[PDB]
Design an enzyme around this catalytic site. Structure first.
Site, PDB file in Angstrom:
ATOM      1  N   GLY A  56      -7.268  -1.160  10.139  1.00  0.00           N
ATOM      2  CA  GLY A  56      -7.230   0.159  10.980  1.00  0.00           C
ATOM      3  C   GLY A  56      -5.773   0.931  10.591  1.00  0.00           C
ATOM      4  CE  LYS A  57      -3.414  -1.104   5.113  1.00  0.00           C
ATOM      5  NZ  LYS A  57      -4.811  -1.984   5.437  1.00  0.00           N
ATOM      6  CB  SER A  91       2.223  -3.888   1.198  1.00  0.00           C
ATOM      7  OG  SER A  91       1.986  -3.609   2.576  1.00  0.00           O
ATOM      8  CG  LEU A 142      -5.925  -8.919   6.738  1.00  0.00           C
ATOM      9  CD1 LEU A 142      -7.034  -9.557   7.602  1.00  0.00           C
ATOM     10  CD2 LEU A 142      -5.648  -9.443   5.433  1.00  0.00           C
ATOM     11  CB  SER A 143      -9.121  -4.432   3.293  1.00  0.00           C
ATOM     12  OG  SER A 143     -10.577  -3.346   3.209  1.00  0.00           O
TER      13      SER A 143
HETATM   14  N1  LIG Z   1      -9.205  -6.815  -5.051  1.00  0.00           N
HETATM   15  C1  LIG Z   1      -8.814  -6.181  -3.607  1.00  0.00           C
HETATM   16  N2  LIG Z   1      -7.973  -6.443  -2.910  1.00  0.00           N
HETATM   17  C2  LIG Z   1      -7.734  -5.533  -1.939  1.00  0.00           C
HETATM   18  N3  LIG Z   1      -8.021  -4.333  -1.917  1.00  0.00           N
HETATM   19  C3  LIG Z   1      -8.881  -3.811  -2.757  1.00  0.00           C
HETATM   20  C4  LIG Z   1      -9.462  -4.747  -3.680  1.00  0.00           C
HETATM   21  N4  LIG Z   1     -10.268  -4.029  -4.630  1.00  0.00           N
HETATM   22  C5  LIG Z   1     -10.373  -2.964  -4.081  1.00  0.00           C
HETATM   23  N5  LIG Z   1      -9.531  -2.755  -3.016  1.00  0.00           N
HETATM   24  C6  LIG Z   1      -9.448  -1.480  -2.373  1.00  0.00           C
HETATM   25  O1  LIG Z   1      -7.752  -1.148  -2.662  1.00  0.00           O
HETATM   26  C7  LIG Z   1      -7.150  -0.803  -1.110  1.00  0.00           C
HETATM   27  C8  LIG Z   1      -6.017  -1.458  -1.393  1.00  0.00           C
HETATM   28  O2  LIG Z   1      -5.054  -1.019  -2.112  1.00  0.00           O
HETATM   29  P1  LIG Z   1      -3.325  -1.053  -1.872  1.00  0.00           P
HETATM   30  O3  LIG Z   1      -3.170  -0.893  -0.179  1.00  0.00           O
HETATM   31  O4  LIG Z   1      -2.747  -0.073  -2.695  1.00  0.00           O
HETATM   32  O5  LIG Z   1      -3.105  -2.870  -2.002  1.00  0.00           O
HETATM   33  S1  LIG Z   1      -1.877  -3.367  -2.564  1.00  0.00           S
HETATM   34  O6  LIG Z   1      -2.212  -4.705  -2.357  1.00  0.00           O
HETATM   35  O7  LIG Z   1      -1.406  -2.960  -3.693  1.00  0.00           O
HETATM   36  O8  LIG Z   1      -0.775  -2.841  -1.416  1.00  0.00           O
HETATM   37  C9  LIG Z   1      -8.157  -1.303  -0.218  1.00  0.00           C
HETATM   38  O9  LIG Z   1      -8.001  -0.715   0.767  1.00  0.00           O
HETATM   39  C10 LIG Z   1      -9.677  -1.527  -0.944  1.00  0.00           C
HETATM   40  O10 LIG Z   1     -10.188  -0.345  -0.516  1.00  0.00           O
END
Ligand SMILES: Nc1ncnc2c1ncn2[C@@H]1O[C@H](COP(=O)(O)OS(=O)(=O)O)[C@@H](O)[C@H]1O
Ligand SMILES: Nc1ncnc2c1ncn2[C@@H]1O[C@H](COP(=O)(O)OS(=O)(=O)O)[C@@H](O)[C@H]1O
EC number: 2.7.1.25
Lengths: 176, 174
Positions: free
Chosen positions: A16-17, A85, A12-13
């Protein structure tokens, strides 16, 4: 001694990744290992600039990161990927393409990430300012069989890094 | 042995892909570790979705440069084949990568148009396709390339030989 491998941190956002990525990067670099970091937040300003967060765009994003990770891995480079991801089938597709691939589930509870709200994104998701935010109104499909799991609300940073390092040693990607 | 981006630029039909494949074979047969980034091929993956506007060609070339840079700085020999019609963008990538050889695959427009390998010149002339390099879109030729291959006047072996010798001279390969 060094063999190529993609170390893939999903979660998840706010889980802590990035923190683990940076600590792991330092530990590897301080031992003389040759690496590249592909952080979703950062590559979305270059490699994957222009993509949003629709299903299609997240698929494109992850597949493109996987493309670059694959080329580096098959040439002996250790690749650290940090990306939400959220789709399991896509993570599996990349894993299958790359082969030398370690899935690391950075697992923090949604409530813990939401309380910290490091970048203020959860509050914006809840108000509807942002649509399709992972874990609130967009999927997160947790790994069912990751190679390493880091429960960041229950383990110290060194413990999380330590488990990834040990897995790399066990599988002989780096020296014990 | 040492990482390097070998960057082939030139008109559609000038012979870039042919030189790339011949060079690739020669390098691989000598045991060298390489990756090929062919514009025609990466546009179906890495740069899928981009067209041929100025901004899309810039995005395309910059993204190819991004990947070439990461591979080059990790000891990989990268073969790039892309029209890359803007000199300032080629220079920007050269600067970022450092270990970079610009190869001008130079065939006359008229020669490329008469062969019309993929039928694109005829489509450009009729207006079926818009903004085709060399017809109604720029091609800015290298003014100081590291190697130049005049493919209408050189045998394939000669063109490949010049790139190889340059790699030898600059100590990228044995
Ligand atoms: N709708 C959203 N969902 C998730 N992350 C978001 C979103 N909008 C902005 N972000 C930002 O974008 C980052 C995520 O980007 P990714 O890791 O590249 O996402 S992923 O789903 O395509 O893997 C998050 O850390 C956050 O800061
Ligand atoms: N308008 C166009 N101009 C040039 N090439 C085109 C065009 N439309 C389709 N193509 C095809 O796309 C190939 C060029 O792609 P690139 O090498 O990736 O171009 S570049 O300008 O962005 O570097 C050509 O070989 C040609 O087959």
């Amino acid at each position: 001694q060094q063999r190529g491998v993609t170390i893939w941190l999903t979660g998840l956002s706010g889980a802590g990744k990035t923190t683990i990525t940076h600590a792991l990067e330092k530990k590897l670099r301080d031992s003389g290992y040759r690496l590249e970091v592909l952080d979703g937040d950062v590559v979305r300003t270059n490699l994957t600039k222009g993509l949003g967060f629709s299903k299609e765009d997240r698929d494109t994003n992850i597949r493109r990161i996987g493309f670059v990770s694959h080329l580096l891995t098959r040439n002996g480079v250790i690749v650290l990927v940090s990306a939400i991801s959220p789709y399991a089938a896509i993570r599996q597709e990349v894993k299958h393409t790359i082969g030398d691939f370690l899935e690391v589930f950075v697992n923090a509870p949604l409530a813990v990430c939401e309380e910290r709200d490091v970048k203020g994104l959860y509050a914006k998701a809840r108000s509807g300012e942002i649509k399709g935010f992972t874990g609130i109104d967009d999927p997160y499909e947790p790994p069912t069989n990751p190679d390493v799991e880091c429960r960041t609300d229950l383990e110290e940073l060194d413990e999380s890094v330590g488990k990834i390092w040990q897995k790399l040693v066990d599988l002989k990607y780096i020296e014990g």
